[PDB]
Design a protein around this ligand. Sequence first.
Ligand SMILES: O=C(O)c1ccc(-c2oc3c(Br)cc(Br)cc3c(=O)c2O)cc1
Length: 333
Amino acid sequence: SGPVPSRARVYTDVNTHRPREYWDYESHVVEWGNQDDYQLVRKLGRGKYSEVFEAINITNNEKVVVKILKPVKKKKIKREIKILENLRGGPNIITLADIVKDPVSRTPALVFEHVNNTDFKQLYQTLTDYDIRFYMYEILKALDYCHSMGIMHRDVKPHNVMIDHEHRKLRLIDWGLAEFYHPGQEYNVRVASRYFKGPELLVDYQMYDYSLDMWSLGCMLASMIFRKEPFFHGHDNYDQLVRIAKVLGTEDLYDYIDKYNIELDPRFNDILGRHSRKRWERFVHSENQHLVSPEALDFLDKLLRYDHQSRLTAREAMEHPYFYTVVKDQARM
Ligand SMILES: O=C(O)c1ccc(-c2oc3c(Br)cc(Br)cc3c(=O)c2O)cc1
């Protein structure tokens, strides 16, 4: 048997046509700075891979953000650093300003730009229909760039999207799981938050591409327009696929399995059963109908697909009628 191979429909060989230095990050040499150039003000958040502090650049008295990294392989550190430097300057990509090492503890610390972030737990209450469309378009601009730069984020989630609603600014952060795309490469399925794990990550299909990020975005869009965060709320990875199967149906799931000859785990076939593909009207009620339109539902359906190749690309998504009002307003400046 063996699973059927896969290639990205867009930006397939962009990395092949680049210098080895670009994607071969194990050979990247980091230029460190002194963390005594920064004074920490307060902890902004914790996490599995880092603890994030607000800090001050004492050489110019300007607010920055210090991400003190948790002990991971040196390889993964170089990967995140190289990717950040490669994507630096891109649309709504977080800006890496410095890379310092504490003189005492000798720990790697990435220094980022400061953005007045309002948390989505309080932000998703003041968002209008236009606000959702607008910010979705902003994430797409960041995703289309990094995809065109041969990089998939592999960890798209609300926690990783900083938003300055007062200044309409958006930034895509945390690229510690991001990876360079190479046609034919089998990647680790152990990426992204459980609720945003694509079906390929759950059925153990390792040859995925940029389309993984498009799934996660779909989970964000579903959460926003239906006011259910998170939309696919599973208790583990096995149940996660079941929660997905209860919406998109088991019909397309087993066709997905059959097409790519994916050997399915002997546990799934006992908890999946059979389900019909529910219409998106079944998730529309009085409290969220002001966010749901035929344009909204059409755009969503074209993101949440088992077959990663049938999902929209970032650019294809940016040309959807769902963003027609946003595009016209951005052209008038
Ligand atoms: O690469 C990362 O993992 C990564 C994490 C956090 C920030 C990051 O977090 C903020 C938080 Br949390 C709260 C507030 Br207020 C501001 C920020 C901010 O400006 C900022 O860059 C940037 C990048």
